[PDB]
């Protein structure tokens, strides 16, 4: 593989030559990818690791370690609501919020009132 790459870069250095056309300059810009991707989806890249809409919105599975009626359940339900409403932050941010809240009230388990 290595010597194949050396020979390939040699062949390239033999290939490349001074261009003649602004279209060729654009072809070069698009070869390195600096020129934008028409059609502009505004999302070419930043895929969020193939995350899922239900993974974002439905936090029912992330909410398992508390009953259905308590005030902690109330607060965490409203938290999941606001998080699903927020598109700006991803599943990683939502789960770190949730786990920080978990640590918070698990260290403050002294009350449970």
């Amino acid at each position: 593989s290595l010597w194949d790459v050396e020979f390939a870069k040699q062949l390239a250095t033999v290939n490349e030559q001074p261009l003649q056309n602004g279209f060729e300059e654009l072809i070069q810009w698009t070869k390195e990818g600096k020129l934008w991707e028409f059609p502009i989806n505004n999302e070419a890249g930043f895929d969020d690791d193939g995350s899922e809409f239900h993974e974002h919105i439905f936090l029912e599975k992330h909410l398992e370690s508390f009953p259905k009626q308590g005030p902690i359940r109330h607060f965490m339900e409203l938290v999941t609501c606001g998080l699903s409403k927020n598109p700006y932050l991803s599943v990683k941010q939502k789960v770190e919020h949730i786990e920080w809240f978990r640590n918070y009230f698990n260290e403050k388990k002294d009350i449970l009132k």
């Binding site: 261009l19 003649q20 056309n21 279209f23 698009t30 990818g33 600096k34 991707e37 890249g45």
Partner: protein
Amino acid sequence: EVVIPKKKTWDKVAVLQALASTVNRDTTAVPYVFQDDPYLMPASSLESRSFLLAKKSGENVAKFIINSYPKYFQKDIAEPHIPCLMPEYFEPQIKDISEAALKERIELRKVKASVDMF
């Protein structure tokens, strides 16, 4: 019942290849690399050689400044991260015979290899 045209897939460069093949070479015009105004217009082979060599020397100067002060251009302001634009790193790490050996083939020189063999 229903007729539907089939989908096709193109390369990002293929469209511009078509656009370029559409148009022929410019007639009675110097290469695009050279400027358009008449004063800067290179009007001889030796001077044109020297001109684009000065341009290449400026390119090498740019490489030198970027690889001498990477922290200035370290900011990835552009949304698409591009290693072609990122600063270049030929910096040996701390003494580590195994990682140093793995970095040998990355640094592309001979003094590191002499020291590693030592």
